[PDB]
Design an enzyme around this catalytic site. Structure first.
Site, short mmCIF file in Angstrom:
data_model
loop_
_atom_site.label_atom_id
_atom_site.label_comp_id
_atom_site.label_asym_id
_atom_site.label_seq_id
_atom_site.Cartn_x
_atom_site.Cartn_y
_atom_site.Cartn_z
CG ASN A 172 3.30 8.92 -0.80
OD1 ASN A 172 4.00 9.00 0.21
ND2 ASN A 172 2.52 7.89 -1.04
N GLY B 155 2.18 -6.70 6.31
CA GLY B 155 2.68 -8.01 5.91
C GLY B 155 3.20 -8.07 4.49
CB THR B 156 1.89 -7.22 1.18
OG1 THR B 156 2.37 -7.53 -0.13
CG2 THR B 156 1.45 -5.78 1.19
CD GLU C 243 -4.01 -4.51 2.73
OE1 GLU C 243 -4.57 -5.00 3.73
OE2 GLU C 243 -3.63 -3.33 2.69
CB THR D 182 -0.02 3.22 11.95
OG1 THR D 182 0.64 2.02 11.52
CG2 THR D 182 0.63 4.40 11.26
CD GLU E 2 29.50 7.31 -13.30
OE1 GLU E 2 30.32 8.12 -12.81
OE2 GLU E 2 29.01 7.45 -14.44
CD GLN F 19 -3.14 0.81 2.11
OE1 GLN F 19 -4.25 0.34 1.91
NE2 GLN F 19 -2.74 1.24 3.29
CG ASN G 33 6.19 7.89 8.46
OD1 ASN G 33 7.00 7.38 9.22
ND2 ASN G 33 4.92 7.49 8.39
CB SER H 55 5.69 -0.06 3.86
OG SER H 55 4.94 -1.24 3.62
#
Ligand SMILES: Nc1nc2c(ncn2[C@@H]2O[C@H](COP(=O)(O)OP(=O)(O)OP(=O)(O)O)[C@@H](O)[C@H]2O)c(=O)[nH]1
Ligand SMILES: Nc1nc2c(ncn2[C@@H]2O[C@H](COP(=O)(O)OP(=O)(O)OP(=O)(O)O)[C@@H](O)[C@H]2O)c(=O)[nH]1
Ligand SMILES: Nc1nc2c(ncn2[C@@H]2O[C@H](COP(=O)(O)OP(=O)(O)O)[C@@H](O)[C@H]2O)c(=O)[nH]1
Ligand SMILES: [Mg+2]
Ligand SMILES: [Mg+2]
Lengths: 44, 51, 428, 440, 60, 426
Positions: free
Chosen positions: D228, D144-145, D71, D179, D254, D11, D206, D140
């Site tokens: 972003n 989990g993903t 997701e 979070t 380089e 995400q 962040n 991230s």
């Protein structure tokens, strides 16, 4: 004759200087841009 | 060749770029004011619906 | 008649060649489309030195241009000149050297070498008798340093009698670009002291200081600095191209310079470099102002004579000059300054005079100097090679590329042998 | 002919990519049909899309992106957004059920079923490339993903490809705000598989983006549109030496020669110097030397580590716009004379500069204004050692009381990878301690 | 909030004034087939270091 | 390339700020968008294309007087990031100004000043003003003094302090911060002089008929003082002397530097009908003590050191005839060891005229300076009226409760008495 050749060469030098400055003033004053160098949607 | 060798051309090109970017920043300022007005009227509609 | 084959190497190699093949193409009077344009027949009679006649009366240069990234090589094809080059003489890799000497010496660039040496024979078999090749490069990155040593040591075997020149760009501390800069130019002097007949030392710090303090420009970009300074010292070989009273070509000037066969490092310079404004106020005689250069404000390398002793000095002049005022001005300069010269040579200066000045100048002159003050550059780039190699700072892009750790300790002692030979003749 | 495939995961990967592929389309003339506009163009002659696009027989272009998620909902918006006609319809690889904040589920149980499909599709963009340089993982550390599924790409993308220079852009969990409560388990167990398997690894927390937005700009209360958009500027400025010509061309190879001292030390920081509001941009000059000393500040470094603690190891500079190669060599004169900014003892030169011609654009509705000069400064600091010491004290308070582990055991994961991963980052944390010690 | 990322329409006002792209029309033309390599019989004319075809007349 | 930075601290300081920056905005005509309709390059710095920015700071620790500045006419003439505000008001409290509140924005102010330090190449002086009367003036300026000194050391930092009157004041426990500031101005500033200006109450209605003024009608003349000091640097003259050259001649003993005099023709249009002004006659009017701007008297004091600022139609003939004819008369008592007692600076361009002020248009003007022992009696009167409250310990708890001691209170006074023991022999 050699002294007058020196004077002639100096006068040719100042004349070419005046022409060169007229060229740089013309290039600064009038401006053109190649189209391929403009961002694609910005052209029209 | 003469255009590349020259120096006052590369002097004046900066002034060309900087006047252009000042005008375009002014355009973006007007757009930001527009967006702020849009969020104000959205808040007013939600106020109406709460009433 | 006495041919020269030009070699270029690196991004710095191709912004010297694109500015060196501009100056010489103004001397012989050649259009960008490649025909003949000048007025005197004295120009065209020695055009078979750097050029080559094509069909229809065209004239193309003999230059082998290399890099490992094609991004540099396209930009020469669209320049002020550059349509006169033959498109067969452009060779370039596919993936870059990574600004790495070991990549550009062993693994990434050695595939290119068998195409680059293969063009070189084609520009050699058309000759009459070569004075020798000429390589323009930089000691910063892998396409110019690692290729530059691999090109030289592959040529110097097969064509040994013909001489070799090179135009190095040594790094500087106070104007430094890459972290790997003292880790390349220490390891490539070792392969450059063996196979080069005459080397120069043209570093970017000195060419900035003469560009803000002599010429007094405002924005010295890399086109406005390479042309007026370092693409016009390579026009010192007008002796080999134009007739003069007392002339001395590229080979006659090497024998009066190197008193031991491992001390060939020079510090060039150009004499009229006044300004846009001070060209109006000065005198174009043969003065001693830029001609006593000891106050070294107009020297094209970093180090200067005050700290050491000149071994041998050149001066190659260009103009309708008098050969008395050449020689008595080699007498205000060896006695009003007295102890900066080698004791055991009483006439250190080799002079020459030719008869066609550069365009727009009555008078010009070129200064080539050898000194024992050049050892302070070679200590100082080996101080930043001893420090980084002590903790093994950036090592592992070199051990995995076929180069072992033994080849660093050779190029540190042999780098400090040149400090030993030059310090012998410091005062003696 | 210098292709550069960007592959996004998770995400965070998708929503950075939406801001990322907004900017890439807007630099060139790709409108969301993919067809460049017809202005009766005789020449054309532009081959600057070729790093990030492929030209078809029609007027269309296709990006190189591989959007991956377990997701389905956030990948469903790019399916029916305004970019519906741009991406090739198979490149938006979705999952079947979400990972839900488990490294074990993200790497063992539910992340293993999808991955046999994606790694075929990376070949379908690998063969189209001619001189491919290296990838760009966008991922991230929280879910989990992002934490576990990216741990399984790196163990198979390394053995399948090898000598392609992989780069990443993580979002490290903050030392104070958070979070999720399970994320310090994810953030230790993801290092052990990305210490060995990522070539160079940029990393941005962040918090300073959350801080520099409220402080440098005159804006308060941002969302992930405004974060972003800022990160999407950095990814363009690094790659832009491949797209547009300049004085000194620093390609993707380089960087990693001039920025990584030792192969276990490849975690640099990142900044962006002339970030400013458009109400604010025309008040002050943004010169060449005003965007470097205002880049070596401790208040505008994108990770929450103070660089007055450690000593600098290597620094790289990437200027962009109308920058002469002179005044970048006089800005260094002001930096190195100071006593505040210490470099490490065994690195005297300590810099790597780069210039590029084309000035940055602005997105319409974008916070940062247009400029003439801009620079992104990548530095490698010793002071990144404290961004982990603030983390593993939140990992022992987990594990010594042995909480939240009963989820992780039954998935296919044993307990032995906990105490192995804690000592593994403790091996890395000691290695930064020894390179900062001066050698006499 | 995910519909912000494509909504507004681009103006000609919001573009850079310059565009310097990298053209490969010359480089691809020599990428397409390999560079020059000698595959020929060697033919150098018989060179001499000083004397090119001398007349020796007045010799016996 | 001859920069000076100017500071408007205090409610009286921003009522200077109207005046001092109105005269800076009419010395060169400055539009409020920073584009003119290279003498300005002390203050300003050209941007990319066409905007100028003044590097002058209004440093106040309450947002109210700052937002009054922004709701003034000169909204975008002053760029708002330089001007320092604070979210919580200090309110006389040196403790809250110095330690607790100021430490979170001190890195911000230092980031700002090191951001414009790249423009600060040839800086001739960090001119500072401040009142002593609150945490607007004392503490945060003091902490800037120490931190800038340990950041550079060499640069020129000068200060022309503001001081409380003996009769009237705003806060009356203010002598605490006045004693503390007399202790802490000696360390890290090159200079600390006279904008103490109680006598501008006397001057603004004595000489120019405007009864019922504000601080602003006073502070026109404080700005005119500023113009005479730094205008020799700003414009070419016959015998111009800059601020580093000022600092290399102004200070006899390195902790002993505090003079007293005025801008001389503080004269309105009503007297300007009739008074034929001459350099000699205006300095004859000036040498009378009763028109000072430091409440003291060197008629009964010793005229030790001097300086002179001249503007307009000044002739070396005129200035030297005046010097001779007033050097004759012992109605002014001269000093023991120093024979002459004059130093001169000359300006071509006569000073600009701002409407809404006391003054009027002048062909020319003179000033003086007279560094005497007449601040010894004023610090003796402050010694006479400080100890009444430190006998019975007023207000100490509010200071103490956030991060300080009674030790600084018991050290600053003895350091001030050390400076008086420096002053008593000369
Ligand atoms: N910088 C940045 N971070 C984001 C953004 N969106 C989400 N994140 C971060 O991503 C983390 C959670 O996102 P993910 O890890 O991708 O969630 P996930 O991996 O899909 O969760 P799973 O269901 O377990 O797969 C949070 O810690 C956020 O801080 C964004 O737009 N910008
Ligand atoms: N008597 C007198 N005092 C003046 C004059 N001009 C400035 N002051 C100073 O003004 C100070 C008090 O008034 P303000 O400057 O308005 O208030 P402040 O110093 O900012 O103090 P705070 O209200 O706490 O912020 C006194 O301490 C004096 O130093 C003047 O013309 N006469
Ligand atoms: N004389 C000259 N030197 C340059 C120029 N551009 C860069 N340099 C310097 O010369 C070196 C060139 O690096 P180079 O070897 O060509 O990079 P590489 O080809 O990628 O390995 C660098 O150290 C630069 O500091 C140029 O146009 N002219
Ligand atoms: Mg998720
Ligand atoms: Mg106040």
């Amino acid at each position: 004759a050699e002294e007058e050749e020196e004077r002639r060469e100096f006068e040719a030098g100042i004349a070419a200087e005046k022409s060169f400055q007229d060229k740089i003033q013309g290039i600064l004053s009038t401006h053109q841009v190649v189209p391929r160098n403009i961002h694609p949607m910005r052209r029209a | 060749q003469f255009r590349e060798r020259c120096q006052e051309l590369r002097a004046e090109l900066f002034c060309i770029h900087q006047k252009a970017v000042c005008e375009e920043r002014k355009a973006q300022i007007a757009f930001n004011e527009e967006l702020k007005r849009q969020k104000v009227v959205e808040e007013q509609m939600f106020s109406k619906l709460w009433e | 008649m006495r041919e020269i084959v030009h070699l270029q190497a690196g991004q710095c190699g191709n912004q010297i060649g694109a500015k060196f093949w501009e100056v010489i193409s103004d001397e012989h009077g050649i259009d960008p489309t490649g025909t003949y344009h000048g007025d005197s027949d004295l120009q065209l009679e020695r055009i078979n030195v750097y050029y080559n006649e094509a069909t229809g009366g065209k004239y193309v240069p003999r230059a082998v241009l290399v890099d490992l990234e094609p991004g540099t090589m396209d930009s020469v094809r669209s320049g002020p000149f550059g349509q006169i080059f033959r498109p067969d003489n452009f060779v370039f890799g596919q993936s870059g050297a990574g600004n790495n000497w070991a990549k550009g010496h062993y693994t990434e660039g050695a595939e290119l070498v068998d195409s680059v040496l293969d063009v070189v024979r084609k520009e050699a078999e058309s000759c009459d008798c070569l004075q020798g090749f000429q390589l323009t490069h930089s000691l910063g990155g892998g396409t110019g340093s690692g290729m530059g040593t691999l090109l030289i040591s592959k040529i110097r075997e097969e064509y040994p009698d013909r001489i070799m020149n090179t135009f190095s760009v040594v790094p500087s501390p106070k104007v430094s670009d890459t972290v790997v800069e003292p880790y390349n130019a220490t390891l490539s002097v070792h392969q450059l002291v063996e196979n080069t007949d005459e080397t120069y030392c043209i570093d970017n710090e000195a060419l900035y200081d003469i560009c803000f303090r002599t010429l007094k420009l405002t924005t010295p970009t890399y086109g406005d600095l390479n042309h007026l300074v370092s693409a016009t010292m390579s026009g010192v070989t007008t002796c080999l191209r134009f007739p003069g009273q007392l002339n001395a070509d590229l080979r006659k000037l090497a024998v009066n310079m190197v008193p031991f066969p491992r001390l060939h490092f020079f510090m060039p310079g150009f004499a009229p470099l006044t300004s846009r404004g001070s060209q109006q106020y000065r005198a174009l005689t043969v003065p001693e102002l830029t001609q006593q250069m000891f106050d070294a404000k107009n020297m094209m390398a970093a180090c200067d004579p005050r700290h050491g002793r000149y071994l041998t000095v050149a001066a190659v002049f260009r103009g309708r000059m008098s050969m008395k005022e050449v020689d008595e001005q080699m007498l205000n300069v060896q006695n009003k300054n007295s102890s900066y010269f080698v004791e055991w040579i009483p006439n250190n200066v080799k002079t020459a005079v030719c008869d066609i000045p550069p365009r727009g100048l009555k008078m010009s002159a070129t200064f080539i100097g050898n000194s024992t003050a050049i050892q302070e550059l070679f200590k100082r780039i080996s101080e930043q090679f001893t420090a980084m190699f002590r903790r093994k700072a950036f090592l592992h892009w070199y051990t995995g590329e076929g180069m072992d750790e033994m080849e660093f300790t050779e190029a540190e002692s042999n780098m400090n042998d040149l400090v030993s030979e030059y310090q012998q003749y410091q005062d003696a | 002919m210098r292709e550069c495939i960007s592959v996004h995961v998770g995400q965070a990967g998708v929503q950075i990519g939406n801001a990322c592929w907004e900017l890439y389309c807007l630099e060139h003339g790709i409108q969301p049909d993919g067809q460049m506009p017809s202005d009766k163009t005789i020449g054309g002659g532009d081959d600057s899309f070729n790093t990030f696009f492929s030209e078809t027989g029609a007027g269309k272009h296709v990006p190189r992106a591989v959007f991956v998620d377990l997701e389905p909902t956030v990948i469903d918006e790019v399916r029916t957004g305004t970019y519906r006609q741009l991406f090739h319809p198979e490149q938006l690889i979705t999952g079947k059920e979400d990972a839900a904040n488990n490294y074990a589920r993200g790497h063992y149980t539910i992340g293993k079923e999808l991955i046999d499909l994606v790694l075929d599709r990376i070949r379908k963009l690998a063969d189209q490339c001619t001189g491919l340089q290296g990838f760009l993982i966008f991922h991230s550390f929280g879910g989990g993903t992002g934490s576990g599924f990216t741990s399984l790409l790196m163990e198979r993308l390394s053995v399948d490809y090898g000598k392609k220079s992989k780069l990443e852009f993580s979002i490290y969990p903050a030392p104070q705000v958070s979070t999720a409560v399970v994320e310090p388990y994810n953030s230790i167990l993801t290092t052990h598989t990305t210490l060995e398997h990522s070539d160079c690894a940029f990393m941005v927390d962040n918090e300073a983006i959350y801080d520099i937005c409220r402080r440098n700009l005159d804006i308060e209360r941002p969302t992930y549109t405004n974060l972003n958009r800022l990160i999407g500027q950095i990814v363009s400025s690094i790659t832009a030496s491949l797209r547009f010509d300049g004085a000194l061309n620093v390609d993707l190879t380089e960087f990693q020669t001039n920025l990584v001292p030792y192969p276990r030390i490849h975690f640099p920081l990142a900044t962006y110097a002339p970030v400013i509001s458009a109400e604010k941009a025309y008040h002050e000059q943004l010169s060449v030397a005003e965007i470097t000393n205002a880049c070596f500040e401790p208040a505008n470094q994108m990770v929450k580590c103070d660089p007055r603690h450690g000593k600098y190891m290597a620094c790289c500079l990437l200027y962009r716009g109308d920058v002469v190669p002179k005044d970048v060599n006089a800005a260094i004169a002001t930096i190195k004379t100071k006593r505040t900014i210490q470099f490490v003892d065994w690195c005297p030169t300590g810099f790597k500069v780069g210039i590029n011609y084309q000035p940055p654009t602005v997105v319409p509705g974008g916070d940062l204004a247009k400029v003439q000069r801009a620079v992104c400064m990548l530095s490698n600091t010793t002071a990144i050692a404290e961004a982990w010491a603030r983390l593993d004290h939140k990992f022992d308070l987990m594990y010594a009381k042995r909480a939240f582990v009963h989820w992780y055991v039954g998935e296919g994961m044993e307990e032995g990878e906990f105490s192995e991963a804690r000592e593994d980052m403790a091996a890395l944390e000691k290695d930064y301690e020894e390179v900062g010690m001066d050698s006499v | 909030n995910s519909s912000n990322y494509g909504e507004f329409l681009p103006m000609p006002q919001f573009f850079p004034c310059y565009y310097t792209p990298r053209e490969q029309v010359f480089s691809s033309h020599i990428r397409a087939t390999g560079f020059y390599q000698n595959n020929t019989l060697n033919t150098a004319p018989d060179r001499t270091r000083t004397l090119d075809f001398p007349n020796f007349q007045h010799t016996l």
